[PDB]
Design a binder for this molecule. Structure first.
Ligand SMILES: [Cl-]
Ligand SMILES: [Cl-]
Lengths: 16, 16, 16, 16, 16, 16, 16, 16, 16, 16, 16, 16
């Protein structure tokens, strides 16, 4: 699965 | 901060 | 699961 | 052998 | 920010 | 030189 | 600087 | 392709 | 197998 | 302590 | 394949 | 310091 890095600012992650 | 791994049933991440 | 770097460009971390 | 990051959560460096 | 492996034991991924 | 993963979003390998 | 991945077929690296 | 640290001695980055 | 670290000083490397 | 990849060529894993 | 780090001044990369 | 890999048949480590 993908580890997506995004900004909610500061860094946050999601897994897909 | 550091990345936390926990179980969402996949692995899931959080930044602490 | 394994945390494996990969490329397609970008490098990214996969959860396998 | 491969040096792979691994998690069941903690991460460990696995020597396969 | 840097993604830095560290130990204090297992390893963890610091976001710096 | 150090090889440091980083992210600002993409991840990349910095050479320091 | 950072490591670039690009396709020249096969993936190749450059330091930028 | 995967980027896998590897060692038989030196560590090396394999591209699979 | 995987590596665990044990530290006090200087870092020590137990294998499992 | 940080676990940082580096290269002077070979890659190696530093303990900082 | 292997990522190679070679010197030519500065450090350059090759995949073989 | 840096992690040293050697052969004991398996891969073993030491901190130097
Ligand atoms: Cl001290
Ligand atoms: Cl031997």
């Amino acid at each position: 699965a993908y580890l997506l890095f995004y900004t909610e600012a500061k860094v946050a992650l999601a897994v897909k």
